[PDB]
Design a protein around this ligand. Structure first.
Ligand SMILES: CC(=O)N[C@@H]1[C@@H](O)[C@H](O[C@@H]2O[C@H](CO)[C@@H](O[C@@H]3O[C@H](CO)[C@@H](O)[C@H](O)[C@H]3NC(C)=O)[C@H](O[C@H]3O[C@H](CO)[C@@H](O)[C@H](O)[C@@H]3O[C@@H]3O[C@H](CO)[C@@H](O)[C@H](O)[C@H]3NC(C)=O)[C@@H]2O)[C@@H](CO)O[C@H]1O
Length: 416
């Protein structure tokens, strides 16, 4: 059935935890709401401008030398603080992120980590400076502060190795790994990075870098994901890209930022994670700033259909997507993270799409945790009968249907 097909789609909440620090227990609560509302995954940006995740062993092997774990950690902490010294914290630990993956798993919530490059790597650039790698930054109208110079082999080799060590960690723990590749040297090019790459004949060198990260992910058993920006820019295929990359499509761009359409990308075989920019919320964004403020995001949650990719009209244009992603951003990371706002937008998105989202199984899990190894024939058959009649396939339209079933389990649990 199509009932099966909709629930099998991805419902993802994206948290910008690269720019701004989130506590283990803050993220823990997001995945709780995600589970309750009927989401399937939490997308967690850990490298996005700042680098807010440190492994237990951060020993990097690149350029014929090795970088001591302690030297690497110290470098990264300084870089993340150079981007933005968050008073709430710097980086999540291995032990914390492991806990979140196992916690999310217990609630049928997948995790999708994101470590961003070659753009959005302010922290890594500084970390590499501190580590002995000179001038890792891209250079156009000015020296970039966000983007790696694709011609710096020493910088490229380090980042490749560093992303490899993160990937080694998520191998076996998560299905997907997002490497981003969005908005190249936007600070240094007046938001025309792709135009500057093609102008300086470095776009092929960009695809070569992205294809590497795609292959690195595959060989480690991770589904590679990237944003759409750099893929077949301006609908040109003079430079080819890896076709197995799950495209998180957010926008077709604006004047002078001529991104590939979803149609052109789909014609080349790409499957989409619908990351429509309409559903965007930037922390502390006000209706007067324009763009992605809360009440527009909550409004577009109903105005923009679930399967509708940015720059297209549904169902007139019906392109294949594995599901949808709702994205929360921290562009000014000093803005207050108000949990209520995110929970409200998450709810709205779920409420407008009750046939895609799952019912709330949290009550059921607590009631099933109350049944013992054994505690009387006839009363034990009612316990088996209620356990049989449980339906794990119900969507958000059927909470009542589910509640009745859990109630029958609660009643049957009190026999003898
Ligand atoms: C004047 C004119 O006609 N055109 C150009 C301007 O539009 C352009 O300024 C841009 O404006 C667009 C809006 O049209 C905006 O993109 C939008 O972002 C909204 C949420 O921020 C979202 O609701 C909306 O769907 C989306 N696109 C639309 C409506 O088409 C631009 O914002 C981008 O890009 C700038 C780069 O200049 C970044 O600073 C922003 O952060 C944002 O990038 C992404 O968005 C999120 C949330 O903001 C970030 O956190 C992410 O890091 C980032 N990437 C991803 C993958 O999400 C932009 O402001 C100007 C720019 O010069 O040019 C005019 O010619």
């Amino acid at each position: 059935g199509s009932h099966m097909e909709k629930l099998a789609k991805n419902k993802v909440i994206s948290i910008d935890a690269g720019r701004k620090y989130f506590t283990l227990n803050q993220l823990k609560r997001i995945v709780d709401k995600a589970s309750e509302l009927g989401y399937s995954d939490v997308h967690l940006l850990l490298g996005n401008d700042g680098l807010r995740f440190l492994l237990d062993d951060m020993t990097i092997t690149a350029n014929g030398k090795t970088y001591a774990s302690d030297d690497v950690k110290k470098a990264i902490i300084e870089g993340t603080k150079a981007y933005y010294d968050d008073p709430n914290g710097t980086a999540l630990t291995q032990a914390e992120v492991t806990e979140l993956i196992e916690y999310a798993k217990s609630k049928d919530i997948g995790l999708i980590p994101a470590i961003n490059s070659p753009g959005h790597m302010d922290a890594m650039l500084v970390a590499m400076e501190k580590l002995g790698i000179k001038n890792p930054q891209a250079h156009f109208d000015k020296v970039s502060k966000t983007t790696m110079d694709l011609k710096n082999e020493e910088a490229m080799n380090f980042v490749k190795a560093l992303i490899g060590k993160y990937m080694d960690f998520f191998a076996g723990k998560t299905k997907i790994f997002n490497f981003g590749t969005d908005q190249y040297a936007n600070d240094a090019t007046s938001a025309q990075g792709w135009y500057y790459l093609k102008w300086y004949q470095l776009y092929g060198k960009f695809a070569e870098y992205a294809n590497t990260l795609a292959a690195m992910a595959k060989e480690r058993g991770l589904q590679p994901m990237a944003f759409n920006d750099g893929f077949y820019y301006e609908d040109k295929d003079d430079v080819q890209f890896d076709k197995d990359v799950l495209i998180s499509y957010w926008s077709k761009g604006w004047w002078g930022y001529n991104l590939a359409s979803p149609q052109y990308l789909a014609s080349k075989g790409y499957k989409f994670l619908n990351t429509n920019g309409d559903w965007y919320y930037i922390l502390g964004q006000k209706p007067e700033d324009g763009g992605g403020f809360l009440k527009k995001a909550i409004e577009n949650t109903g105005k923009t259909p679930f399967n509708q990719l940015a720059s297209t009209k549904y169902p007139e244009v019906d392109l294949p997507t594995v599901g949808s992603m709702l994205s929360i951003w921290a562009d000014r990371p000093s803005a207050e993270y108000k949990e209520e706002e995110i929970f409200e937008l998450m709810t709205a998105f779920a409420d407008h799409n009750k046939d895609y989202f799952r019912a709330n199984y949290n009550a059921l899990r607590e009631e099933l945790a109350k049944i013992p190894t054994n505690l009387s024939k006839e009363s034990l058959e009612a316990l088996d009968a209620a356990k049989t009649a449980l339906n794990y396939n119900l969507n958000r339209n059927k909470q009542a249907e589910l509640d009745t079933l859990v109630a029958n389990l609660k009643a049957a649990l009190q026999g003898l």
